Design a protein around this ligand. Structure first.
Ligand SMILES: *[C@@H]1O[C@H](CO)[C@@H](O)[C@H](O)[C@H]1NC(C)=O
Ligand SMILES: *[C@@H]1O[C@H](CO)[C@@H](O)[C@H](O)[C@H]1NC(C)=O
Ligand SMILES: *[C@@H]1O[C@H](CO)[C@@H](O)[C@H](O)[C@H]1NC(C)=O
Ligand SMILES: *[C@@H]1O[C@H](CO)[C@@H](O)[C@H](O)[C@H]1NC(C)=O
Lengths: 369, 369
């Protein structure tokens, strides 16, 4: 008895797909196997996403694993909720409550505000790039009001075509309007590189900067290849390499072959990819526990009725009731498919590389060394 | 020769639909008539919007008139651009460039920043409610950085269920953490009422507040029915009642019958509704000028190919090339379907009612009396 699922992958998310195939192997059994059907697509494109989702709906699928972007998230949330098909995703978690959405990624906002407190910052910059940026920004601004922080929040993303000395050094005239040194960067890695390169070209106070990078993959590959010119650099990490699961997993990961398993074979793995492998565990567990109650039951998105609410909700609740350890640590979901009981490691870039200075917990706030 | 169009109306946008039927009459001729097919729907619902749009696409339509919301705007922009069907809309204009979208509504951000300057504000609050709020907020924050304004930006919308003294008076503890009196309100009218009512209950400095209401209908009906307790209250207005078109139009508007023309019969008209009537002019003009070059040509959104790009783009350009005077004044569109050469009247609430203290122009910044 194989269970059919969707896979919505962004074009060129090779590592993530590789992690998926791996997880597929690792948590398959005699008892059953998940059979995925994969679309690769421009996830920013809402028409593209609608169309792939419908295609999957009409094959009949028990769940969809997949990704969204700022532009497409409402398409997913709406089609999920309308059609009672569960979507599991490493993508950014939505502010709101949204049924039929299992959110593999934990929420950084908590940690980010705690970190801001810990470093005793009260006058700083926030450079945002996209809805992910905004949504965290908002939480910050709401607290800025409450703790009287002085935030200079700027939208680095909203630059037409290239961003130059003309824009970025224009930006550092605005930032050197208050001698601003503490900086939060919530942008794609290229922007981080491009912004930081500008601090360097300008050539004043380069080592004096303290950057916080607001994502969960500090020690994924490409970030720490940026020349930060010796500034203090902090960040976050959900895949802890001192864990047994992870080190075990990484032994296998680094010895696979790129030709067969593209983006594999590295010391580390992108959180999106780890969350993907974790997702596969979460899915198989919930179908396992669905079989423990002896349930199955059975398998055009615009004309034909939705999956009956009662059938759909039992799959949703199975997914949300799962509790496991995987690469992202303790996987557990609240009523809304948001992760709970998770911890996020706080990281600083020291001479000898990136070092955990502490963790943050959902149950508890920042804890040291 | 009748031309077929879509009408996507939000459920309970009666005035707007009434304005549409009126405009339909007013700018119909022997030469041709537009035949609209109407869906009424939850425009916040992306699945609802997709489905109505597809339904229209598959009837074959030369254009769609309609509305979107924060949640649905990307569905419209994506399906428009994918399918080469022009969408005309009084809804909030998008930051970006988006093909096949004709944006009837002018952009307030310009005026809002100019107004903020004129009043020589440099420490103030911004209470936002939704993407419309955010997108303007962003423009403000970007300039705040540049002019060293001290903005306390708070998300009044993101309150679970009811907002109380517990939230709103919690909010006025955060706002009386800097004796904040200058306030920008970018929220639905109920929030405006609810926020202002709280200033009143608190009962300190009530007349000392200065509110700016960030929308284009100051002198639409319901806003000025709020008890502002004698504070300075400013705002914006695109329908100028001293114009001839408008006064002529209003003579007719107030003498129609509610039973036949619901939300009609009032002294004033909501900008969304005026922009609707203006839209109808814009559409008929562009089909008129399409007939001047002797063009027609001819009439499942997920399987079947799009409207051929070359057919579609000639309708788009016709719409964008239109220039007319209607209720919103000088209607003219740039390359991206954004309004240009528009003016926005600046308004203050005085004892003797709302009075134009000045206008702002796209060509020029704030001008007095
Ligand atoms: C950067 O890190 C060093 C190392 O502890 C610290 O002494 C310094 O104060 C930090 N810079 C700022 C601006 O806090
Ligand atoms: C939290 O996670 C730890 C290990 O990560 C686990 O032992 C514990 O049961 C979890 N707590 C809850 C409330 O599930
Ligand atoms: C409110 O308007 C009055 C009328 O001109 C003005 O004198 C006063 O300064 C305004 N209040 C503020 C806080 O600017
Ligand atoms: C601007 O609008 C005025 C009247 O509203 C009109 O006379 C003028 O032609 C317009 N300017 C441009 C550049 O179209």
């Amino acid at each position: 008895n194989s269970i059919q699922i969707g896979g919505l992958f962004p074009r060129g998310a090779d590592q993530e797909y590789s992690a998926f195939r791996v997880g597929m192997v690792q948590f398959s059994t005699s008892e059953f196997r998940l059979t995925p059907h994969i679309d690769n697509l421009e996830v920013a494109n809402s028409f593209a996403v609608t169309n792939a989702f419908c295609s999957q709906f009409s094959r009949g699928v028990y769940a969809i694993f997949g990704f969204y972007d700022c532009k497409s998230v409402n398409t997913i949330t709406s089609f999920c909720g309308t059609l009672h098909v569960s979507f599991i995703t490493p993508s950014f978690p939505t502010d709101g409550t949204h049924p039929f959405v299992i959110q593999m990624r934990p929420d950084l906002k908590g940690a980010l505000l705690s970190l801001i407190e810990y470093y005793q910052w009260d006058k700083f910059a926030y450079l945002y790039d996209s809805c992910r940026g905004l949504s965290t920004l908002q939480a910050v601004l709401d607290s800025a009001a409450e703790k009287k922080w002085q935030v200079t929040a700027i939208n680095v993303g909203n630059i037409n075509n290239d961003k130059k000395d003309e824009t970025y050094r224009s930006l550092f005239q605005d930032l050197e309007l208050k001698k601003e040194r503490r900086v939060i960067l919530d942008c794609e890695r290229d922007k981080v590189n491009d912004i930081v390169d500008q601090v360097i070209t300008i050539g004043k106070h380069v080592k004096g900067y303290h950057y916080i990078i607001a994502n969960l993959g500090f020690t994924d590959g490409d970030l720490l290849k940026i020349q930060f010119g010796g500034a203090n650099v902090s960040g976050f990490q959900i895949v802890d390499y001192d864990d047994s699961l992870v080190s075990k997993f990484i032994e296998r990961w680094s010895t696979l072959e790129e030709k067969e398993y593209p983006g594999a074979h590295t010391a580390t793995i992108k959180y999106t990819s780890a969350l993907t492998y974790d997702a596969v565990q979460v899915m198989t567990e919930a179908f396992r526990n669905l079989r423990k109650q002896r349930i199955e039951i059975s398998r055009d998105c615009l004309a034909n009725p939705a999956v009956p609410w009662g059938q759909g909700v039992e799959i949703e609740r199975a997914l949300k009731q799962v509790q496991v350890e995987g690469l992202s640590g303790n996987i557990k979901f609240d009523q809304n498919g948001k992760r709970i009981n998770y911890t996020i490691n706080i990281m600083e870039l020291k001479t000898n590389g990136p070092r955990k200075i502490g963790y943050w917990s959902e149950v508890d706030k920042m804890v040291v060394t």
